[PDB]
Design a protein around this ligand. Structure first.
Ligand code: BCL
Ligand code: BCL
Ligand code: BPH
Ligand code: BPH
Ligand code: U10
Ligand code: SPN
Ligand code: SPN
Ligand code: SPN
Ligand code: SPN
Ligand code: SPN
Ligand code: SPN
Ligand code: SPN
Ligand code: FE
Lengths: 76, 51, 273, 255, 44, 325, 44, 51, 51, 44, 51, 44, 51, 44
């Protein structure tokens, strides 16, 4: 599922560009906006990749997989 | 609104709890610091001014 | 004189151009179309350099200096004594480097292996071309190139570095220096590990990859593997070259003032109280 | 500070000492690298009249693991091939060689292999290093696209079979070979492909080095559960020889 | 029904009840805090 | 195009490897617990850990942490304990070496005492790490090449920090602990003693650094080129020569007229890398103690170039002409 | 009875009681310290 | 409010205790340093100015 | 309060003992350093000033 | 009983008692030192 | 206080000795150096001035 | 008896005895040195 | 006091001997240099000024 | 008897006797040297 991670990284890059342009609009300079945009890229891209792409596809496999770990625990 | 309990049939409670615990503290810290970055709502400086 | 295992590899074919017209060897060297071009260009450049040295008035290796023209000549041609020989030698050197790269390509094709080495050499060629072609072209004069002298091509570096007050404050210079140091450290560690694995104390058996993996996991807690280390080294060297080129190309045509002042964006952010 | 004579001071003495040390170090480094491939020979297989300015080094001994004996270098060439199907194109030295039969089948040129030992490579425990994935307990795919079950396309657009297994390196947790089951039209049995010469896609695996008709003559392994160094060399080089000998246009000048 | 984590309907109901009670008490404290801040110094 | 072997197509994961062992019982000090990183698995190995915890490692970790904390708290106190100002000026602060007036005596805490204490801690930590790297190689039954190559850099470290201040008789000759201050020290040291370009040993160290970078680029490209013949398994090629080594040697023999072996190239790499800090330390040790002006030294030894043309902008153009008026 | 750790309902009460007692002790100490600081130097 | 003990059935108490201790110590150190960063509540300087 | 002994059923004493020792030593060292860094509680300078 | 570290109740009580004795001694030493320092040089 | 011998049932007798030796030597050296930095407790300078 | 290093009660008791025997001598030497230093060059 | 011989049942004599030799030589050299760094205790300068 | 290194009681006692003899000789030599140095150029 590397494609979803690459999509999240691209979304983060686009969000960084948008935030940079917005910071130009507010009244900052190029580098001041660029630094905050890069921050936003890395933070939001990492968060989305860990969270959204961590929801691997499963409908009934997830429940028994969740239930299986509920049995290993409680006796260890 | 009586069927809001189904969100626990989809979302993992532990991950959501960790995310909320991080987010609430972060938002509280940012709000307090933003209140500290002004002049009218800075109690540390207000105490010195009134001393 | 061949090696004891070389004869079976000496077959015909794998030429980009020329066929069997230049398909032979001279001693150990392999000859081709690009070998002929390389020989011509290199010999012409060397003989022109020594002609300029003779006309300068000194044959001392430390004191020979061939310099680019004045800034008033612009991008045009200068008299051969007032800096035109430098332009001719630059053309010859570019041709020789390109021919060397293409000869390496032909040898790789004949041996049936990958084309990584010419690709790596292309980055050094790019850095040289950025030094002598792209930056002078953007600045508007051929006189911005460095002279061809053993000890006179360091005065140019010093004066160009001091033209911006403090060149250590260039961020791309920082990146390039960090890459250089990291590459040297990685090479030292790789060589030491391989040599120690292949050369145990007297009376002991040789080791294998598992022993090296254990060693570095015991040492620092992580091992990159016998295949990842080569990728890492190649990438580090290529990045060092690329960022050196970027650092030299942003200094003149993009930034004009001193480099320490560039950090005023950080020093004057609105977030600070 | 003062000078010993003329302009000679401590710095000059250090510089000259470093010059001497560097000369000796260069001699040592060059001599250390002449333990394989010497003495030199001419194009007729005889010893050449010229041997260079660096004399041969002295002997060193390697003590190998798993009771495989000792190796002493420099010495005789034990990896030498016996009968090569090659022909001289000139009466003197410095000219290429001409294949006599089928270069891909005769192992000459970019298809050449070395006569290595006919035993598998062992790990620290003494087990064969490369093992099929169906005999390795606890191993599974963790990332990327699984190639098992996908069709295989040759260098000319012909489908020859399906990927049936992978051969992995248990010690280093890396995939080495991909096993192929051939259609009856294109041959019989199974063949191995090294991982460095394949491109796995979402619906297919492509091998651009050789064509469809060259798949039946790939060297086969004697055992279904292990591979030796000699077999790996012959299989791997057969695959490399196709970059030049699979077509007439790959050998002639590109222009 | 639509279980993903391994919960039953009544288990989810109990979880929701406890979580909502805690959240509403936490907000009840913050309401008094906000009224105290407004009384000390209005900001509107 | 053909696969270039820069990123792995498919990853596989098995049981974690705990490591080899012998009668020295390396297991008793190794930790328990490992992880797997799929992001790094695209380039190299994915397993992370475990690590070996001796006494040298713990001592080095604790003492280096003490040095770090001392420097950081001094920098924080220098700014008034203001966290926003500490963050704003992080790259500009430092822990300055003592004043020249105190010689080699112990200075007050305000003018270099903390610097000396932190330097002592850093020295102890570095020596402990070197002892650990020697001990590990001694217990796994291997050569000690790693220890020698570390000692090569420790030599320059000590020359820059310990030996030269003692020879010059002052603790003020050391390097400040800061990002920009240390670059400032580099430039000021270069200016104060003539031109460091004309120091021959600086030139030799530059030569070896360039050669080392060139050699790793060449070796990485060569190994990635012949990886289709199992060229990354270098040890088995050394013990039993295959076609990959022959092709790799023949490439360079046909390119430049001479080549190497699978084991001899690593000797070349080790020496080019090691020879840089040694020459650098030798060159640094001679500055001030022996030679005080390197341009004058070059002039006296007749390898300083001479120029004929004139100086000044008025010899080439006009002030109004430059402005375009 | 849901359990993602393996603890039982009976076991998950004594620990909560001890944690609550520790929290109460910490709160009392903090309240005393804040009252002393407010006496020394007010800030409201 | 009477069913808050169920939190230990979701999170392992060891990690929770370690995180709570680290967070409390770091927050206390940060707050003490922030109080030190001002002039009104800098107790060392106040004591120095009263002698 | 009386059940505080149960911490040893959750935490290993060996690790927490070392952690406590290291933390206590570090805290004492930094507090003594802070005292030494000020001009009002520097006993070394007080000895010189008094005599 | 619940025990993640393989210890019994009585051993835990003994260790807690010894740790408490050590803590009380350390606290007494700290209190004496603080009283002496405050007598020598007040900071409030 | 009479049952403090049980620390050897928790900790090894060799690690403690090594750590104690290194810690004691480092602390003694640091304290002696700190004493040497002042103008009132430097025995060398006091002997020099009293001659 | 609870144990983690393999030592017994008597071995630990003897080791503690000799350990404190050395510790008391070290502390006495340190105390004598401190008293001599205070007599020579007083602080506080 | 009379059972100090047991220290050799814990420490390897080889390591202790090597460390003792290195430590003694380094400490002697450091003390000699520290004396040499002063004016009152430098015997070379005293000998030079004597005549 | 307890033994970590692997020696016995008698070997340890003999080694300690030799070590203490050498240590006493070295300490006596150092004491004489220090006394001579103090007489030559006294501190304190
Ligand atoms: C006052 C001086 C300034 C300064 C001014 C500059 C300037 C100005 C430059 C840099 C450049 C560089 N600086 Mg800086 N720099 C300073 C001091 C430092 C310090 C330090 C203090 O430690 C370091 C580590 C560096 C290091 C570096 C590298 C990051 C970089 C070198 C380029 C390179 O290697 O490209 C290597 C690439 C090549 C050019 C190789 C070309 C090879 C060709 C293609 C093949 C040759 C064939 C040959 C003729 C064959 C004949 C031989 C036959 C056998 C006969 N600088 C000071 C602060 N620095 C340089 C840079 O970035 O250049 C782009 C540069 O010009
Ligand atoms: C204006 C600047 C001056 C100049 C001033 C200096 C000075 C001054 C010095 C250098 C030095 C060097 N110069 Mg010069 N140099 C100039 C221009 C250049 C240019 C250029 C213009 O392109 C180049 C290529 C270089 C490059 C170089 C290197 C060849 C050499 C560094 C040796 C080395 O191995 O460093 C690598 C660094 C080290 C090995 C340091 C030691 C590292 C130790 C081991 C660190 C221990 C680890 C640590 C304690 C723990 C960290 C925490 C961890 C995360 C746990 N200089 C100009 C002319 N140069 C050095 C030298 O040797 O010169 C003779 C030196 O001192
Ligand atoms: C440039 C070399 C320097 C270095 C490098 C280094 N150390 C490393 C690594 C690297 C590259 C690791 O990858 C590895 C590690 O775990 O990194 C997170 C590690 C490590 N070196 C360590 C310490 C260490 N190394 C030291 C030495 C050094 N570190 C060298 C000087 C020192 C010093 C100077 O004293 C110390 C204190 C450990 C923190 C760690 C050893 C790993 C271990 O024992 O357990 C780790 C395994 C786990 C329990 C799980 C993985 C850890 C993850 C952080 C948690 C979960 C993440 C997930 C599983 C994937 C991670 C994502 C990746 C992006 C990392
Ligand atoms: C041949 C010369 C080259 C060289 C070689 C070299 N360096 C080496 C070695 C070798 C052979 C080692 O064996 C050794 C090593 O461990 O390598 C992995 C090392 C090393 N060279 C290093 C640095 C280094 N080398 C450099 C250069 C060079 N070293 C030369 C180019 C340079 C520079 C300026 O160019 C630097 C900065 C280190 C990475 C390592 C030495 C490790 C060491 O001494 O550690 C001592 C411990 C401490 C100071 C404690 C630090 C405590 C920290 C505050 C936290 C713990 C560390 C943590 C991993 C960092 C923070 C991580 C965050 C996630 C929190
Ligand atoms: C593991 O794997 C690996 C290996 O393997 C095991 C390796 O080994 C290596 C390789 C590494 C090493 C060997 C380590 C050492 C390397 C270095 C330190 C790198 C630095 C190298 C150098 C400084 C030396 C490089 C030298 C060069 C580039 C010059 C050599 C070139 C020539 C002399 C000319 C080239 C010849 C040509 C073009 C053919 C001639 C042209 C013709 C037209 C032929 C027609 C005939 C004539 C013109 C007349 C006859 C010609 C003659 C006699 C030629 C000479 C002419 C002169 C004028 C002198 C690596 C990396 C590796 O990872
Ligand atoms: C690790 O994780 C786990 C789960 C184990 C934990 O959570 C563990 C947690 C701990 C071990 C926590 C431990 C906490 C402490 C030991 C806290 C101790 C706190 C104090 C001793 C605080 C003292 C504060 C004193 C103050 C603020 C004094 C102020 C004095 C004045 C302002 C002066 C005013 C004048 C007068 C006369 C007041 C008189 C003095 C008084 C103190 C009332
Ligand atoms: C981690 O994940 C999970 C799911 C577990 C969580 O989300 C857990 C979350 C928690 C454990 C959260 C815990 C939260 C707390 C413990 C919060 C505590 C909050 C306080 C104690 C807040 C106190 C606020 C006090 C205030 C604002 C005082 C103000 C005083 C003045 C302004 C002084 C002037 C007052 C005057 C004049 C009185 C006038 C006011 C009137 C209302 C009449
Ligand atoms: C940073 O702040 C400044 C600079 C102001 C400071 O200076 C700060 C300073 C401090 C914070 C200092 C703190 C100092 C301490 C806490 C010091 C503590 C010291 C000790 C606990 C010392 C203990 C020493 C013990 C000794 C010497 C024991 C010796 C024992 C023996 C010689 C006998 C042992 C032999 C045995 C067991 C053999 C028997 C073997 C058998 C098998 C039975
Ligand atoms: C001013 O602002 C800044 C930030 C600068 C500050 O200075 C901030 C400072 C702080 C925030 C400081 C905070 C400090 C604390 C919270 C300190 C807490 C300290 C403790 C809880 C200490 C506990 C100590 C406990 C001890 C010493 C107990 C026992 C010791 C023993 C030696 C007992 C021995 C035990 C044995 C042998 C076990 C028995 C074995 C068996 C097998 C049964
Ligand atoms: C490493 O692990 C193990 C377990 C092995 C250990 O812990 C081993 C530890 C050791 C082997 C430790 C060894 C320690 C030593 C050998 C320590 C030795 C210490 C000294 C010899 C100290 C001497 C100190 C002397 C001093 C401070 C003298 C001062 C003199 C004056 C100040 C003069 C002034 C005198 C006047 C005015 C007269 C009045 C004085 C009166 C007392 C009345
Ligand atoms: C490495 O591991 C092992 C176990 C092997 C060891 O630890 C081995 C260790 C050794 C083999 C160590 C060996 C050590 C030596 C051989 C040491 C020798 C030391 C000396 C010979 C020292 C001599 C010192 C002499 C001095 C200080 C002379 C001073 C003279 C004056 C100051 C002159 C002034 C004298 C006056 C005014 C007279 C006053 C003196 C009177 C006595 C009245
Ligand atoms: C306070 O906030 C927290 C807690 C977060 C912190 O701790 C923050 C910490 C930081 C922000 C820290 C930042 C640290 C740096 C930026 C550090 C930079 C350090 C350097 C650039 C160091 C360079 C060091 C050395 C150099 C360049 C060369 C040589 C040095 C030496 C050989 C040193 C050895 C010294 C010796 C041998 C002398 C010792 C003296 C004796 C008398 C024995
Ligand atoms: Fe290699």
């Amino acid at each position: 599922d590397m494609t979803c991670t690459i999509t999240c990284w691209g979304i983060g890059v686009l969000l960084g560009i948008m935030t940079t342009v917005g910071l130009m609009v507010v009244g900052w300079s190029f580098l001041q906006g660029a630094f905050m945009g890069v921050l936003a890229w890395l933070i939001v891209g990492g968060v989305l990749a860990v969270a959204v792409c961590g929801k691997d596809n499963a409908e009934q496999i997830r429940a028994e997989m969740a239930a299986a770990r509920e049995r290993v625990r409680g006796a260890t | 609104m009586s069927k809001f309990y189904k969100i626990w049939l989809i979302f993992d409670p532990r991950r959501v709890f960790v995310a909320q615990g991080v987010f609430l503290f972060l938002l509280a810290a940012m709000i307090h610091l933003v209140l500290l970055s002004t002049e009218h709502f800075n109690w540390f400086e207000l105490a010195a001014a009134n001393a | 004189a061949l090696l004891s295992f070389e004869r079976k590899y000496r077959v015909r074919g794998g030429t980009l151009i020329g066929g069997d017209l230049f398909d032979f060897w001279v001693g150990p060297f392999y000859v081709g179309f690009f070998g002929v071009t390389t020989a011509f260009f290199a010999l012409l450049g060397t003989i022109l350099i020594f002609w300029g040295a003779s006309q300068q008035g000194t044959f001392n290796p430390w004191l020979i200096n061939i310099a680019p023209p004045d800034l008033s000549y612009g991008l045009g041609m200068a008299p051969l004594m007032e800096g035109g020989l430098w332009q001719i030698i630059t053309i010859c050197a570019i041709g020789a480097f390109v021919s060397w790269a293409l000869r390496e390509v032909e040898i790789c094709r004949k041996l049936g292996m990958g084309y990584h080495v010419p690709f790596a050499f292309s980055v050094a060629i790019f850095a040289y071309v950025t030094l002598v072609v792209f930056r002078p072209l953007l600045m508007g004069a051929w006189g911005h190139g460095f002279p061809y002298g053993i000890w006179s091509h360091l005065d140019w570096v010093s004066n160009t570095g001091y033209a911006y007050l403090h060149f250590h404050y260039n961020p791309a210079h920082m990146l390039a220096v960090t890459f250089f140091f990291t590459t040297t450290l990685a090479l030292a560690l790789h060589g030491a590990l391989v040599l120690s694995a292949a050369n145990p104390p007297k009376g002991e058996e040789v080791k294998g990859p598992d022993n090296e993996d254990t060693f570095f996991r015991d040492f620092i807690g992580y091992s990159i593997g016998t295949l990842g280390i080569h990728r890492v080294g190649l990438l580090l060297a290529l990045n060092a070259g690329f960022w050196s080129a970027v650092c030299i190309i942003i200094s003149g045509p993009v930034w004009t003032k001193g480099w320490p002042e560039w950090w005023n964006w950080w020093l004057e952010m609105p977030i600070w109280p | 500070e003062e000078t010993f004579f003329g302009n000679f001071d401590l710095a000059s003495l250090s510089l000259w000492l470093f010059y001497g040390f560097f000369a000796l170090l260069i001699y040592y480094l060059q001599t250390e690298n002449m333990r394989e491939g010497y003495p030199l020979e001419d194009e007729d297989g005889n010893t050449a009249a010229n041997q260079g300015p660096f004399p041969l080094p002295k002997e060193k001994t390697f003590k190998l693991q798993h009771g495989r004996g000792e190796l002493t270098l420099p010495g005789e060439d034990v990896q030498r091939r016996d009968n090569l199907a090659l022909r001289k194109t000139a009466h003197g030295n410095g000219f290429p060689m001409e294949p006599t039969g089928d270069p891909m089948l005769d192992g000459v040129g970019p298809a050449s292999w070395s006569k290595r030992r006919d035993v598998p490579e062992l790990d620290a425990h003494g087990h064969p290093k490369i093992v099929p994935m169906s005999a390795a307990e606890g191993f599974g795919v963790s990332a990327g696209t699984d190639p098992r079950g996908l069709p295989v396309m040759a260098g000319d657009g012909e489908i020859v079979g399906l990927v049936s297994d992978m051969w992995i390196d248990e010690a280093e947790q890396l995939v080495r070979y991909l096993e192929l089951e051939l259609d009856p039209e294109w041959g019989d049995g199974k063949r191995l492909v090294q991982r460095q010469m394949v491109r796995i896609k979402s619906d297919r695996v492509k091998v651009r080095s050789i064509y469809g008709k060259h798949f039946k003559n790939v060297p086969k392994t004697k055992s279904p559960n292990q591979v030796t160094l000699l077999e790996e060399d012959k299989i791997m080089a057969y695959y490399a020889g196709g970059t030049l000998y699979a077509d007439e246009s790959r050998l002639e000048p590109q222009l | 029904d639509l279980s993903f984590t391994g919960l039953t309907d009544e288990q989810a109901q109990e979880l929701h009840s406890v979580y909502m009670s805690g959240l509403w008490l936490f907000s009840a404290v913050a309401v008094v805090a906000h009224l105290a801040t407004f009384i000390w110094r209005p900001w509107f | 195009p053909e696969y270039q072997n820069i990123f792995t197509q498919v990853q596989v994961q098995g049981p974690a490897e705990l490591g080899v062992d012998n009668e020295n019982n390396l297991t008793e000090e190794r930790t328990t617990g490992t992880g797997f990183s799929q992001l790094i698995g695209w380039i190299g190995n994915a397993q992370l850990g475990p690590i070996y915890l001796g006494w040298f490692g713990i001592i080095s970790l604790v003492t280096g942490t003490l040095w770090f904390n001392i420097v950081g708290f001094n920098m924080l106190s220098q700014v008034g304990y203001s966290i926003p100002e500490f963050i704003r000026q992080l790259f500009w602060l430092a822990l300055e070496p003592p004043s020249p007036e105190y010689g080699l005596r112990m200075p007050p805490l305000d003018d270099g005492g903390w610097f000396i204490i932190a330097s002592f801690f850093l020295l102890v930590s570095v020596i402990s790490w070197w002892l650990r790297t020697y001990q590990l190689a001694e217990m796994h039954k291997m050569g000690k090449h790693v220890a020698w190559a570390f000692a090569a850099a420790i030599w320059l470290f000590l020359v820059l920090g310990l030996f030269r201040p003692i020879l010059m008789g002052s603790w003020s000759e050391a390097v400040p602990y800061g990002i920009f201050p240390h670059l400032d020290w580099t430039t000021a040291f270069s200016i104060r003693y003539g031109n460091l370009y004309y120091n021959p040993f600086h030139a030799l160290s530059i030569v070896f650094l360039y050669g080392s970078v060139l050699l790793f680029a060449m070796h990485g490209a060569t190994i990635l080129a012949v990886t289709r013949f199992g060229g990354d398994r270098e040890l088995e090629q050394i013990y039993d020569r295959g076609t990959a080594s022959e092709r790799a040697g023949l490439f360079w023999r046909w390119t430049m007229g001479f080549n190497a072996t699978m084991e001899g190239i690593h000797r070349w790499a080790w020496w080019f890398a090691v020879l840089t800090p040694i020459t650098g330390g030798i060159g640094i040790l001679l500055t001030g103690t022996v030679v005080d002006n390197w341009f004058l030294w070059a002039v006296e030894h007749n390898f300083a170039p001479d120029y004929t043309q004139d100086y000044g902008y008025e010899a080439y153009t006009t002030y109004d002409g430059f402005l375009g008026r």
